């Protein structure tokens, strides 16, 4: 059936945080609908496709965002129903704190149209990069600030906390000259109750423009009541609340499994200094002198032709659509391929492609069945 | 001081999920070190820079990953100390479940070298896109599978759960022909204890190649004990555990704030059908007929010259380095700019650039001080 919806992301920082697949899908679209913040990103998008509509114009002063989101979602779905390949574009990751993307895809899917979200770089992705933390260590709780308050969502003092939309507590509507965020104090009360007055809170704003610096300003929970401080929080403000303490390891679980890493989390309070070059680190580095690639390591051993075609499949959605519809047909027609390369394409599976592109050791192969 | 480290990401899916800034930083690097999974991504990177080293060769059978990670981290830092601009490349987001990137940057930073992480598209970013969920609704807990078990990290039955590295419970080492994951049953016990035998668990593997489909296979916690099922879990397997129930809203917090959305989370058990086109949705859509852009909406009104230069700053790290060192000097030298465009560049701040690129309403401006 004719018509499809693909939602892509631009990332947070202007132009540069758009993925290659996002860009190519924008170029290939019959109709593009975008919701971005900065106008360089907007201008960039307009150079890539003739038929763009700015979804930002469906916001308004005193207008409930649900109305705006229904309207955005419907404008996309309508062009899908005319049989068109529609691309929606949202800043960051198009599915991370975004109603109208999930909305438009579920509608498109429930009426039997091809409906896909491509992931992008979120504000949380930026937060991790800019504040130098890893969700894995010591885990990550991520909430919308108001949902956190309204359903009294549990915090963990032993894991990362990320709070989106701290700049609009309780606000269901929109205003072009922002809002006061009068209910901010309500969040600040919940934070003090759960973490305490002296506990650190990092005010995070990712640079939007290539030349700008992030905001990574640490405050105490209590400092967030100072008018001068509270007023710096806005619509693109995210809070990071580090853990209060390391959590004791579990004796019972260590047994069944038959059993700090550098660097320390710098935003953590009373964080001990961690040594980079412990013995096992010094021993690991001494080994580099005599290091050879292990036997089962498989070096790249591919051709310009196979490199070019695997790039095309990733970057040229027309090349991909042929391939997807008949592997063997597509492979036969690619010029300057070795039989081993053609065969790998005909099969499509990751192993075959790895064998054709990598010089596989006799060992790995053996494994087989 | 001479020498810098920039760590970038490739995203998960081959080539296409690399950001434009990642690609340009790879091109500009004196020395590139990469750790990617698929060889098309690897071959792509090698076309972009002469001086690449594959970090994957510092893994080995029976070799502790801490050794591998120290070695990766040291190879990068050493070229930084020779005064070189070093780019590290890791698949996905270079800071999400990645020791050696955080490690190499903290060392580079602690010795006074420029040290930056650019964010990328993580496996969790892909999970949200592919399984059609939003962390915001109803919140997200993200853990490394073993850390989850070892520190007995709290679950929330009312929020999303994402578990990384479910394919290597308790395993500190590496093997080129994978592992059995014998301690898997230990995780399956923790899940049953917290969620129950019938509770859904989604086996998520993001397609690595453009033509492939994700794995989005739902199982019961109890089904994960079947050998045939358990054996499908591997080193690139992530678990998504949806909520067991919606959490009652808090009466007290609703008051202080002076107060389902479509679509439903499809992986949630006994999930009720949600209506897309309720009255407020129908009323929102009726308004589209007479919709004009509001007064305070500010249309793009920019030039090829300003579009081109704002693109260059995002895509050409040399253009950016000039600009960063002398705004006014850089602006003066850009050809075919209006005074308003030159002025915006000289100031650098987002407002000035927005005024130069957008046709700002007399209203927004008024706000001012």
């Amino acid at each position: 059936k004719a018509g499809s919806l693909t939602i892509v992301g631009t990332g947070i920082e202007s132009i540069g945080q758009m993925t290659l697949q996002a860009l190519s899908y924008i170029e290939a679209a019959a109709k593009v609908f975008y919701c971005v913040i900065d106008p360089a990103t907007e201008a960039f998008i307009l150079t890539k496709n003739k038929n763009c509509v700015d979804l930002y114009q469906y916001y308004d002063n005193g207008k409930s965002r649900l109305n705006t989101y229904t309207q955005m979602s419907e404008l996309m779905v309508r062009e899908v129903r005319k049989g068109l390949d529609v691309v929606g574009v949202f800043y960051g990751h198009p599915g991370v704190f975004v109603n109208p993307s999930h909305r438009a895809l579920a509608i498109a899917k429930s009426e039997g149209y091809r409906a896909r979200m491509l992931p992008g770089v979120s504000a949380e992705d930026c937060l991790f990069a800019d504040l130098c933390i890893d969700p894995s260590n010591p885990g990550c709780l991520t909430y919308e600030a108001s949902d956190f308050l309204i359903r009294d969502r549990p915090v963990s003092i032993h894991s990362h906390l990320v709070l989106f939309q701290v700049g609009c507590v309780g606000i269901a509507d929109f205003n072009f000259t922002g809002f006061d965020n009068n209910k901010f104090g309500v969040l600040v009360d919940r934070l003090e109750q759960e973490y305490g007055a002296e506990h650190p809170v990092v005010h995070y704003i990712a640079a939007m423009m290539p030349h700008q610096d992030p905001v990574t300003d640490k405050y105490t929970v209590a400092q967030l009541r100072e008018p001068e401080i509270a007023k710096r929080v806005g619509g693109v403000s995210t809070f990071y609340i580090p853990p209060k303490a390391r959590k004791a390891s579990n004796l019972d679980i260590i047994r069944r499994l038959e059993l700090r890493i550098y660097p320390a989390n710098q935003w953590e309070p009373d964080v001990p200094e961690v040594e980079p070059y412990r013995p096992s680190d010094q021993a690991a580095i001494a080994q580099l002198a005599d290091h050879a690639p292990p036997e089962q390591y498989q070096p790249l051993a591919t051709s310009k032709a196979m490199s070019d075609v695997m790039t095309k499949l990733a970057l040229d959605p027309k090349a991909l659509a042929d391939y997807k519809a008949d592997h063997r047909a597509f492979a036969q027609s690619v010029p300057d391929l070795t039989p081993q390369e053609r065969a790998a394409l005909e099969l499509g599976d990751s192993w075959a492609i790895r064998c054709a592109m990598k010089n596989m050791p006799s060992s790995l192969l053996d494994a087989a069945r | 001081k001479a020498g810098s480290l920039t760590i970038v990401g490739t995203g998960i899916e081959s080539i296409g999920q690399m950001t434009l800034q990642a690609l340009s930083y790879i091109e500009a690097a004196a020395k590139v070190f990469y750790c990617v999974i698929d060889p098309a991504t690897e071959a792509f990177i090698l076309t972009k820079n002469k001086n690449c080293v594959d970090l994957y060769q510092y893994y080995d059978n029976g070799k502790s990953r801490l050794n591998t990670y120290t070695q990766m981290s040291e190879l990068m830092v050493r070229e930084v100390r020779k005064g070189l601009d070093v780019v590290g490349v890791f698949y996905g987001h270079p800071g999400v479940f990645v020791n050696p990137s955080h490690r190499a940057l903290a060392i580079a930073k602690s010795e006074g070298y420029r040290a930056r992480m650019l964010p990328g598209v993580s496996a969790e970013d892909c999970l949200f896109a592919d399984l059609c969920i939003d962390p915001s609704n109803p919140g997200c807990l993200t853990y490394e599978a073993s850390d989850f078990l070892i520190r007995d990290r709290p679950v929330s039955i009312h929020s999303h759960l994402v578990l990384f590295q479910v394919g290597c419970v308790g395993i500190a080492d590496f093997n080129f022909t994978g592992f059995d994951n014998n301690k898997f049953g230990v995780l399956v016990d923790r899940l049953e204890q917290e969620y129950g035998a019938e509770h859904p668990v989604v086996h998520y593997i993001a397609a690595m190649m453009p033509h492939q489909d994700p794995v989005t296979d739902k199982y019961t916690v109890a089904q994960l004990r079947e050998p045939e099922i358990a054996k499908r879990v591997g080193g690139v397997s992530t678990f998504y555990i949806p909520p067991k129930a919606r959490k009652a809203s808090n009466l007290d917090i609703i008051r202080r704030l002076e107060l389902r959305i479509y679509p439903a989370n499809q992986w949630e058990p006994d999930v009720p059908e949600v209506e897309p086109y309720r009255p407020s949705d129908q009323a929102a859509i009726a308004q589209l007929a007479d919709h004009a852009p509001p007064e305070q909406y500010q249309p793009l009104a920019t030039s090829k010259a300003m579009s081109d230069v704002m693109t260059k700053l995002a895509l050409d790290p040399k253009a950016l380095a000039d600009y960063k060192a002398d705004h006014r000097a850089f602006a003066q030298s850009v050809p075919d700019l209006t005074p308003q465009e030159r002025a915006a560049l000289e100031l650098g701040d987002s407002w000035a650039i927005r005024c130069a690129m957008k046709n700002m309403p007399s209203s927004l401006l008024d706000a001012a001080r």
Binding site: I37, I150, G170, T177, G235, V236 | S350
Partner: peptide, 12 residues
């Protein structure tokens, strides 16, 4: 200069 592009709301 107060950018506000919120693309989600919660029950209220």
């Amino acid at each position: 200069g107060f950018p506000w592009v919120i693309v989600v709301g919660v029950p209220g």
